[PDB]
Design an enzyme around this catalytic site. Structure first.
Site, PDB file in Angstrom:
ATOM      1  N   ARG A   3       0.844  -1.188   0.000  1.00  0.00           N
ATOM      2  CA  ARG A   3       0.000   0.000   0.000  1.00  0.00           C
ATOM      3  C   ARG A   3       0.876   1.233   0.000  1.00  0.00           C
ATOM      4  O   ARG A   3       1.628   1.477   0.949  1.00  0.00           O
ATOM      5  CB  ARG A   3      -0.986   0.023   1.174  1.00  0.00           C
ATOM      6  CG  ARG A   3      -2.029   1.157   1.060  1.00  0.00           C
ATOM      7  CD  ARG A   3      -1.708   2.380   1.945  1.00  0.00           C
ATOM      8  NE  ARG A   3      -1.855   2.050   3.362  1.00  0.00           N
ATOM      9  CZ  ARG A   3      -1.860   2.926   4.361  1.00  0.00           C
ATOM     10  NH1 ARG A   3      -1.736   4.226   4.122  1.00  0.00           N
ATOM     11  NH2 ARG A   3      -2.006   2.496   5.604  1.00  0.00           N
TER      12      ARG A   3
ATOM     13  N   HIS B 120      -2.508  11.218   1.368  1.00  0.00           N
ATOM     14  CA  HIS B 120      -1.813  10.988   2.630  1.00  0.00           C
ATOM     15  C   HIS B 120      -1.169  12.261   3.186  1.00  0.00           C
ATOM     16  O   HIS B 120       0.064  12.452   3.115  1.00  0.00           O
ATOM     17  CB  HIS B 120      -0.769   9.875   2.504  1.00  0.00           C
ATOM     18  CG  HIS B 120      -0.420   9.240   3.814  1.00  0.00           C
ATOM     19  ND1 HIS B 120      -0.464   7.877   4.017  1.00  0.00           N
ATOM     20  CD2 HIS B 120      -0.063   9.783   5.004  1.00  0.00           C
ATOM     21  CE1 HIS B 120      -0.125   7.605   5.263  1.00  0.00           C
ATOM     22  NE2 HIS B 120       0.118   8.744   5.887  1.00  0.00           N
TER      23      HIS B 120
ATOM     24  N   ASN C 210      -6.054   8.376   3.684  1.00  0.00           N
ATOM     25  CA  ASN C 210      -5.488   7.880   4.914  1.00  0.00           C
ATOM     26  C   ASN C 210      -5.838   8.794   6.083  1.00  0.00           C
ATOM     27  O   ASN C 210      -5.475   9.976   6.091  1.00  0.00           O
ATOM     28  CB  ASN C 210      -3.969   7.749   4.819  1.00  0.00           C
ATOM     29  CG  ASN C 210      -3.370   7.162   6.081  1.00  0.00           C
ATOM     30  OD1 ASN C 210      -3.440   5.953   6.300  1.00  0.00           O
ATOM     31  ND2 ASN C 210      -2.799   8.018   6.931  1.00  0.00           N
ATOM     32  N   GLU C 211      -6.555   8.229   7.054  1.00  0.00           N
ATOM     33  CA  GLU C 211      -6.805   8.847   8.370  1.00  0.00           C
ATOM     34  C   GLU C 211      -7.408  10.250   8.297  1.00  0.00           C
ATOM     35  O   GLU C 211      -6.798  11.229   8.755  1.00  0.00           O
ATOM     36  CB  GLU C 211      -5.527   8.830   9.213  1.00  0.00           C
ATOM     37  CG  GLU C 211      -5.029   7.418   9.466  1.00  0.00           C
ATOM     38  CD  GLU C 211      -3.829   7.343  10.390  1.00  0.00           C
ATOM     39  OE1 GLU C 211      -3.210   8.400  10.663  1.00  0.00           O
ATOM     40  OE2 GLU C 211      -3.507   6.216  10.844  1.00  0.00           O
TER      41      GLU C 211
ATOM     42  N   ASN D  64      -6.600   1.313  10.659  1.00  0.00           N
ATOM     43  CA  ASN D  64      -5.215   1.518  11.128  1.00  0.00           C
ATOM     44  C   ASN D  64      -5.204   1.432  12.636  1.00  0.00           C
ATOM     45  O   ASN D  64      -5.833   2.261  13.301  1.00  0.00           O
ATOM     46  CB  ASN D  64      -4.684   2.901  10.746  1.00  0.00           C
ATOM     47  CG  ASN D  64      -4.555   3.098   9.255  1.00  0.00           C
ATOM     48  OD1 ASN D  64      -4.719   2.168   8.465  1.00  0.00           O
ATOM     49  ND2 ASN D  64      -4.251   4.323   8.857  1.00  0.00           N
TER      50      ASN D  64
ATOM     51  N   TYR E 159      -2.845   0.794  16.254  1.00  0.00           N
ATOM     52  CA  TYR E 159      -1.571   0.748  16.950  1.00  0.00           C
ATOM     53  C   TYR E 159      -1.709   0.501  18.451  1.00  0.00           C
ATOM     54  O   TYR E 159      -0.922  -0.246  19.042  1.00  0.00           O
ATOM     55  CB  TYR E 159      -0.839   2.070  16.755  1.00  0.00           C
ATOM     56  CG  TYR E 159      -0.395   2.338  15.346  1.00  0.00           C
ATOM     57  CD1 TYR E 159      -1.213   3.041  14.461  1.00  0.00           C
ATOM     58  CD2 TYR E 159       0.849   1.890  14.896  1.00  0.00           C
ATOM     59  CE1 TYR E 159      -0.809   3.281  13.154  1.00  0.00           C
ATOM     60  CE2 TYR E 159       1.276   2.130  13.598  1.00  0.00           C
ATOM     61  CZ  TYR E 159       0.441   2.827  12.735  1.00  0.00           C
ATOM     62  OH  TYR E 159       0.862   3.076  11.456  1.00  0.00           O
TER      63      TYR E 159
ATOM     64  N   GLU F  41      -2.882  -0.852   8.858  1.00  0.00           N
ATOM     65  CA  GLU F  41      -1.625  -0.399   9.466  1.00  0.00           C
ATOM     66  C   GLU F  41      -1.484  -0.929  10.862  1.00  0.00           C
ATOM     67  O   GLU F  41      -2.448  -0.948  11.629  1.00  0.00           O
ATOM     68  CB  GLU F  41      -1.565   1.111   9.593  1.00  0.00           C
ATOM     69  CG  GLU F  41      -0.833   1.830   8.519  1.00  0.00           C
ATOM     70  CD  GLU F  41      -0.979   3.340   8.684  1.00  0.00           C
ATOM     71  OE1 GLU F  41      -0.864   3.812   9.847  1.00  0.00           O
ATOM     72  OE2 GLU F  41      -1.222   4.043   7.662  1.00  0.00           O
TER      73      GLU F  41
ATOM     74  N   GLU G 168       8.938  10.738   9.655  1.00  0.00           N
ATOM     75  CA  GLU G 168       7.786  10.561  10.531  1.00  0.00           C
ATOM     76  C   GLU G 168       7.114  11.893  10.930  1.00  0.00           C
ATOM     77  O   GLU G 168       7.004  12.227  12.116  1.00  0.00           O
ATOM     78  CB  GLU G 168       8.227   9.746  11.750  1.00  0.00           C
ATOM     79  CG  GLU G 168       7.151   9.465  12.810  1.00  0.00           C
ATOM     80  CD  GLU G 168       5.880   8.776  12.270  1.00  0.00           C
ATOM     81  OE1 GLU G 168       5.907   8.184  11.157  1.00  0.00           O
ATOM     82  OE2 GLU G 168       4.844   8.839  12.981  1.00  0.00           O
ATOM     83  N   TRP G 169       6.664  12.647   9.926  1.00  0.00           N
ATOM     84  CA  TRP G 169       5.982  13.960  10.118  1.00  0.00           C
ATOM     85  C   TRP G 169       6.643  14.838  11.184  1.00  0.00           C
ATOM     86  O   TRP G 169       7.827  15.128  11.066  1.00  0.00           O
ATOM     87  CB  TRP G 169       4.460  13.803  10.327  1.00  0.00           C
ATOM     88  CG  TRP G 169       3.837  12.920   9.276  1.00  0.00           C
ATOM     89  CD1 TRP G 169       3.365  11.651   9.452  1.00  0.00           C
ATOM     90  CD2 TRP G 169       3.666  13.222   7.885  1.00  0.00           C
ATOM     91  NE1 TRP G 169       2.889  11.158   8.269  1.00  0.00           N
ATOM     92  CE2 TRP G 169       3.063  12.095   7.287  1.00  0.00           C
ATOM     93  CE3 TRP G 169       3.951  14.337   7.090  1.00  0.00           C
ATOM     94  CZ2 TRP G 169       2.748  12.040   5.925  1.00  0.00           C
ATOM     95  CZ3 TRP G 169       3.629  14.289   5.734  1.00  0.00           C
ATOM     96  CH2 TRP G 169       3.035  13.143   5.167  1.00  0.00           C
TER      97      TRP G 169
END
Ligand SMILES: OC[C@H]1O[C@@H](O)[C@@H](O)[C@@H](O)[C@@H]1O
Length: 484
Positions: free
Chosen positions: A95, A139, A184-185, A322, A324, A395, A449-450
């Site tokens: 993806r 994204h 995404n999100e 997603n 975590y 995710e 990572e942003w």
């Protein structure tokens, strides 16, 4: 060549904990997930127009050490190597996301043929190697032009702009991409972009850029839902019967566990699910917002017209979840009452421990608690609540600190235990009737990572940022072993 300790054979690699492809449904997809901005590089080249993140990155102090994603891990040039690693580790699918501003530098109008060519090279190569392409359309990377013209997600103009972009992508790539995600999100797009300003465009009540945490997140979410629905309508009416693919959305879902068994704590946990997931999934499944949100947020929330409600309801073939982490949820006492922010609207207390015992160990990220049973509870919840829709666990993963050497970085036993335990809990949910058809680890490579920049490593493949060399972590080999 690295120090000798790099080549120690971690015996945890061979403990698959009883898992194999046989423990999962026939044709169950195992994949990895990335995003355009986090892995491609070539941010200011190949004809790519700038995104909101490109302007956001320019404020000093925003990324640690003022790092950028102009190069990141350079998948633009190294995509063949990355696909080969994926294949060699046994994965079925990848993806990835398409950069809106790489295709339409101004968001609408002229096409950047050079960007089209890249995604064609990438997709052609995955197909050549037997990796299924799962294309995400957005994204976090809104073209800057659209933000300048009408403040992007805050205007109803974005809906046709996005749909046309989606439309172009279906036309151009859909002969070999049979699996699409619109967003995404979107919850994060709305909450981090417009509630706390943590992500681009950095808007919020107290923020430098301006904003309004009481209204803008709800406005943003509303147009994301309409844009998703409008995109899916194009797919269904123009492409789906001919291309024979499917289209969904990716929704982040933190599991909220009631702190105690009281009515108030159980209700608080449900309220948080409403605001976190229901916010997007209720419209998509029932054609309406969560009741709690409507009663609390009142007229700060937009409403769907009957036509809109019909376009939005059933506008997925599957939902990507997603997942975590998990928290405990408390009733926080009597509520105020006067609007402050989307997050305050939830009216909940968070808790990270119970009876002196933490809910789980923490990963590097401030927000990530390692809580394997949360994945089981989350999946069961969407099954029970939403008529058992077809799901992809789109995710799952965890991070190490960024500042570790190759030698230390590749021996990620904590991540092995993470995946073994989470995948075990997901299996249990499937055995009990959950309609899950795929699983994707975030992420293949350590990447940008942003807001954490390169202080966070999520990959199962270590990347030396000095040389851009790839070194598979023990967790990559753990998958290789589990998947054969
Ligand atoms: O935090 C790890 C990851 O979690 C989700 O938000 C992903 O879609 C990425 O944007 C991010 O890097």
């Amino acid at each position: 060549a690295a120090a000798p300790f790099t080549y120690w054979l971690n015996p945890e690699i061979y403990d698959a904990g009883g898992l194999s492809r046989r423990a999962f449904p026939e044709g169950f997809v195992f994949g990895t997930a990335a995003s355009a901005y986090q892995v491609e590089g070539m941010a200011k080249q190949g004809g790519r127009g700038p995104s909101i993140w490109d302007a956001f990155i320019e404020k000093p102090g925003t990324i640690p050490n003022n790092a950028t994603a102009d190069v990141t891990v350079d998948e633009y040039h190294r995509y063949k190597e990355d696909v080969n690693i994926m294949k060699n580790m046994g994965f079925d699918a990848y993806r990835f996301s398409i950069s809106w501003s790489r295709i339409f530098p101004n968001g609408t109008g002229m096409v950047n043929q050079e960007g089209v060519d890249y995604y064609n090279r990438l997709i052609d190569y995955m197909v050549k190697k037997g990796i299924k392409p799962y294309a995400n359309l957005y994204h976090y990377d809104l073209p800057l032009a659209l933000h300048e013209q009408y403040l992007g997600w805050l205007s109803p103009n974005i809906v046709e702009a996005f749909a046309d972009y989606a439309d172009f992508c279906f036309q151009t790539f859909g002969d070999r991409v049979k699996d699409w995600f619109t967003f995404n999100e979107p919850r994060c797009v709305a909450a981090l972009g417009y509630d706390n300003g943590f992500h681009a465009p950095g808007r919020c009540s107290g923020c430098d850029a301006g904003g309004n945490s009481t209204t803008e997140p709800y406005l943003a979410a509303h147009h994301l839902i309409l844009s998703h629905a409008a995109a899916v309508k194009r797919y269904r009416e123009k492409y789906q019967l001919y291309q024979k693919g499917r289209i969904g959305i990716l929704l982040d879902f933190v599991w909220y566990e009631p702190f105690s068994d009281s009515n108030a704590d159980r209700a608080a946990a449900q309220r948080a699910r409403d605001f976190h997931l229901g916010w997007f999934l209720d419209p998509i499944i029932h054609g309406r917002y969560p009741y709690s949100m409507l009663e609390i947020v009142k007229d700060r929330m937009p409403t769907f017209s009957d036509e809109e409600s019909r376009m939005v309801k059933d506008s997925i073939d599957y939902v990507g979840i997603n997942h975590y982490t998990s928290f405990y949820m408390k009733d926080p006492g009597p509520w105020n009452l006067t609007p402050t922010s989307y997050q305050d609207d939830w009216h909940v207390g968070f808790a990270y421990e119970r009876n002196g015992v933490p809910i789980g160990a923490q990963a590097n990220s401030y927000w990530l608690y390692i809580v394997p049973w949360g994945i089981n509870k989350a999946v069961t919840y969407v099954k029970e609540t939403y008529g058992n829709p077809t799901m992809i666990l789109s995710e799952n993963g965890m991070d190490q600190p960024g500042n570790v050497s190759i030698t230390q970085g590749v021996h990620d036993t904590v991540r092995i235990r993470y995946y073994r335990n989470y995948i075990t809990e997901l299996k249990k949910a499937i055995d009990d009737g959950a309609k899950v058809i795929g699983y994707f680890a975030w992420s293949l490579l350590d990447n940008f990572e942003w807001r954490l920049g390169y202080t966070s490593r999520f990959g199962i493949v270590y990347v030396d940022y000095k040389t851009l060399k790839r070194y598979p972590k023990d967790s990559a080999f753990w998958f290789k072993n589990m998947l054969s």
